[PDB]
Amino acid sequence: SMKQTGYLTIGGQRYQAEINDLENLGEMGSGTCGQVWKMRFRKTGHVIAVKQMRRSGNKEENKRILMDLDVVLKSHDCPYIVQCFGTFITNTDVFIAMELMGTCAEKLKKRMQGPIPERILGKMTVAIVKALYYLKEKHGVIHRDVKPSNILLDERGQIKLCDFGISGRGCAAYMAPERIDPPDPTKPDYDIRADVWSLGISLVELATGQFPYKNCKTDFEVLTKVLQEEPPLLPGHMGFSGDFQSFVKDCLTKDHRKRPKYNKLLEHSFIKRYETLEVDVASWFKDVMAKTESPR
C-alpha cells in the first residue's frame, strides 16, 4: 500500500521526502499559478504535478479535492487514471503529488487547430472507456463530466482520465438527451449511459476538429439541438474506419435505453482493434508539439 504522506513513490521506489525537496517550476498550466505547480523532485530529477490545498482555502473546493484524491488513492491498479505519488501535510497546506501530464485533449485540439488522427483516438477510446468502467465497477462512481479537458495525454504516449471531478457528484455541450430531459418522470436519474454519450460527442469533436454544435450562440440553443436534431455522426468522406463510425453511432444513440453501457462497448471491434494494434502515440505527440511550438 502506498505511503500516503511524507513520501513520494515513483518508478517502483519509495522516497522519504518533504516539501523543500521540490523545486517550484511554476504554474502547471496557464492561470494555474497559486494552486497546481509543476515541480522537480531534487533527489531523483522527476518532474511532477503538485496540487496545493490551502487550509485557509475554500471549504467546498477542499471537500472536492479530498473526494477526488480518495478515489485516486484507491485507483492505484488502474493504468488509465492519473496516479498520486504521495502527499505532504504541513500546518497550512496539503501538497498532493500527481503524475504530470503534457496536456488535455481540449488544449491538444486548440493547439492542433485541426483533426486528431483516428489511430490516436482509438488508443484514447480504449483508455477512457477502461478508466470509466473501472471507476463504476470498482468504486461505484458515475463520472458525470466526460469531455476533452478530462482526457489527458503525455509525451510517453500515455492517455489517462484526469483526477478533476473523478469522484463524480457550458459542458452542457456534452450532455446526453436524457440528462437534459429525463424521459421518465418517476425514474429521472441518468446513469453511465449519459457519460457514453459525452464520450461520443468528444470523439466526434476531436476527430473533426469541430464541436458538433459550434453554430450555437447560447447554452440553451445547444440543449435544443441535442434534443431536436439527429445525433451528430462522423462524416463519411474523411476516411474513418467503419469500426470507428459504428463505435460513435453506438455511443450517440439518442434513446438511452438502447445505448451501450461500458461492458458492451468493451466488446466493440473498435476497442478490440486498439487493445492490440501498435500505435506510437508518444512519437506522434512529440512530433505535433514540435510542429506547433511557439518560441519561448
Swiss-Prot record:
Activated by phosphorylation by specific MAP kinase kinase kinases such as MAP3K1/MEKK1, MAP3K3/MEKK3, MAP3K11/MLK3 and MAP3K12/DLK. ATP binds at residues 28-36, 51. It is an enzyme of class 2 (transferase). The keyword Protease does not apply. The active site is at 145 (proton acceptor). It catalyses: L-seryl-[protein] + ATP = O-phospho-L-seryl-[protein] + ADP + H(+); L-threonyl-[protein] + ATP = O-phospho-L-threonyl-[protein] + ADP + H(+); L-tyrosyl-[protein] + ATP = O-phospho-L-tyrosyl-[protein] + ADP + H(+). This is Dual specificity mitogen-activated protein kinase kinase 7. It comes from Homo sapiens (Human).
